[PDB]
Design a protein around this motif. Sequence first.
Motif, short mmCIF file in Angstrom:
data_model
loop_
_atom_site.label_atom_id
_atom_site.label_comp_id
_atom_site.label_asym_id
_atom_site.label_seq_id
_atom_site.Cartn_x
_atom_site.Cartn_y
_atom_site.Cartn_z
N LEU A 11 29.29 6.02 32.43
CA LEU A 11 28.34 6.04 31.27
C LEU A 11 26.94 6.39 31.77
O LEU A 11 26.27 7.28 31.21
CB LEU A 11 28.32 4.74 30.50
N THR A 12 26.54 5.77 32.88
CA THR A 12 25.28 6.08 33.50
C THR A 12 25.16 7.50 33.96
O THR A 12 24.11 8.17 33.74
CB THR A 12 24.99 5.09 34.66
N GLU A 13 26.19 8.01 34.63
CA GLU A 13 26.15 9.40 35.05
C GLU A 13 26.10 10.36 33.83
O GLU A 13 25.36 11.34 33.86
CB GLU A 13 27.27 9.75 36.05
N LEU A 14 26.83 10.03 32.79
CA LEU A 14 26.78 10.83 31.54
C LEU A 14 25.36 10.84 30.99
O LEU A 14 24.85 11.89 30.57
CB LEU A 14 27.73 10.28 30.49
N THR A 15 24.72 9.67 31.01
CA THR A 15 23.38 9.47 30.51
C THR A 15 22.43 10.33 31.27
O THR A 15 21.56 10.97 30.62
CB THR A 15 22.99 7.98 30.43
N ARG A 16 22.60 10.42 32.60
CA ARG A 16 21.73 11.29 33.42
C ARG A 16 21.88 12.75 33.04
O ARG A 16 20.88 13.45 32.90
CB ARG A 16 21.95 11.14 34.93
N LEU A 17 23.11 13.20 32.90
CA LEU A 17 23.38 14.60 32.53
C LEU A 17 22.80 14.91 31.13
O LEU A 17 22.16 15.97 30.95
CB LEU A 17 24.86 14.87 32.55
N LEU A 18 22.99 13.99 30.18
CA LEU A 18 22.48 14.14 28.80
C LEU A 18 20.95 14.13 28.75
O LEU A 18 20.35 14.85 27.95
CB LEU A 18 23.09 13.11 27.84
N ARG A 19 20.28 13.36 29.61
CA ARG A 19 18.85 13.45 29.68
C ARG A 19 18.34 14.84 30.09
O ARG A 19 17.36 15.37 29.51
CB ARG A 19 18.36 12.38 30.65
N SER A 20 18.99 15.46 31.08
CA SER A 20 18.63 16.81 31.45
C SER A 20 19.00 17.84 30.32
O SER A 20 18.30 18.84 30.10
CB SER A 20 19.34 17.18 32.76
N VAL A 21 20.15 17.65 29.68
CA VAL A 21 20.54 18.52 28.58
C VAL A 21 19.44 18.42 27.51
O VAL A 21 18.92 19.47 27.02
CB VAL A 21 21.94 18.19 28.02
N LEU A 22 19.01 17.19 27.19
CA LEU A 22 18.04 16.96 26.12
C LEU A 22 16.72 17.62 26.46
O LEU A 22 16.11 18.27 25.59
CB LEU A 22 17.86 15.48 25.78
N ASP A 23 16.29 17.53 27.73
CA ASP A 23 15.02 18.23 28.12
C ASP A 23 15.07 19.71 27.97
O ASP A 23 14.13 20.32 27.50
CB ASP A 23 14.61 17.84 29.55
#
Length: 121
Positions: A11-23
């Motif tokens: 979940l944490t790793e997904l969250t990291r990837l989604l933060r970069s996607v969102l930027d």
Amino acid sequence: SMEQVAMELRLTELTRLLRSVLDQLQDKDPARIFAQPVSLKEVPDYLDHIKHPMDFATMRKRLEAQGYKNLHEFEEDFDLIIDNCMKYNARDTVFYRAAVRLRDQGGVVLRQARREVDSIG
């Protein structure tokens, strides 16, 4: 349990990837048309038109509470941003046009994020 921890790590790793996607998606909105919720003070009738408002700030709040379980959920929220704008605003507006450009440009980013979320599991 160790299993629960492992799921939390994913979940944490997904969250990291989604933060970069969102930027990356938000860089496709340099005018910041989609940065914040539509103001009910300035568009008091908005909720008569649009049932599920969405914006990048609200997505960011959800993300930092690790509230996206998968990419599908996150894309749903992104699509709401675009789709709400294209219903509320007419075709000949700066708003609608900004949505079309965000969609077109964001499609590229999401096409590869889908491969990265699959690939890295």
